[PDB]
Specification:
The structure is cut from a larger assembly and holds two copies of chain A, one copy of chain B (38 residues) and one copy of chain C (98 residues). Chain A has 32 residues and is an all-alpha fold. Chain A is built from one helix and no strands. The chains are: A mainly alpha (32), B mainly alpha (38), C alpha+beta (98). Chain B: Belongs to the nucleoporin NSP1/NUP62 family.
């Protein structure tokens, strides 16, 4: 499964991409 | 930042929830400051 | 879904300005230099805002005769208005000095 | 990894911070002290 105890290493590369869009959006707000 | 490959998804979600509530606060206080300048 | 595939998605729908559920939603008011009284029932409700959120934007407008309610939903929207306060400050000083 | 990734992001919103970042930047302060700590590691190696 995915559990919340899953590491970023292990994640399906689609979810791993969307998470690296989300991490950019959160940093975006600090820049603004 | 690219997410560190060793991190747990639970840690990353709680880290991002904390930052979104910090950003939520500062959005309303900055927008309230803009409203006083209006 | 899993619980996680919902936690993360409803969270992403809390940041996104295209969401009805955005945590960022300020209500500004902008003055209409036409000198023409506007019917508040004629003002076209913004995209991605609920009916309940717009009823609030009309009920807290400090003068419906001359001010239109405007939503902001990110720091980009805040600074797309902050730069216009500096634009107005520079023009307002220049007419005060003259 | 963090500090390079923030300057990569600031230079992607095209955001002129009105409070201009102080000059030199605090990571350049830290880079010069990172040269001192290597220099004094060399001194303490010569003396050993």
């Amino acid at each position: 499964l995915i559990t919340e105890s899953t590491k970023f290493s292990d994640l399906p590369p689609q979810l791993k991409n969307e998470l690296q869009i989300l991490n950019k959006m959160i940093i975006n707000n600090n820049s603004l | 930042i690219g997410i560190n490959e060793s991190k747990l998804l639970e840690q990353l979600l709680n880290e991002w929830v904390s930052e979104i509530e910090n950003q939520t606060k500062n959005f309303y206080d900055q927008a309230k400051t803009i409203f006083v300048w209006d | 879904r899993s619980i996680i595939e919902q936690k993360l998605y409803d969270f992403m729908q809390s940041i996104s300005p295209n969401s009805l559920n955005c945590r960022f939603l300020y209500w500004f008011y902008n003055y209409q230099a036409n000198g023409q009284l506007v019917d508040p029932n004629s003002i076209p409700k913004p995209p991605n805002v609920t009916v309940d959120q717009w009823a609030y934007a009309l009920s807290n407008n400090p003068d419906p005769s001359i001010l239109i309610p405007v939503a902001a939903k990110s720091f980009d929207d805040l600074i797309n208005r902050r730069m216009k306060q500096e634009e107005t400050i520079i023009a307002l000083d220049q007419n005060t000095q003259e | 990894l963090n500090s390079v990734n923030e300057q990569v992001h600031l230079l992607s919103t095209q955001f002129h911070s009105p409070f201009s970042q102080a000059r030199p930047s605090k990571e350049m302060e830290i880079i010069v002290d990172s040269l001192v700590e290597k220099i004094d590691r060399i001194k303490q190696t010569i003396l050993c």
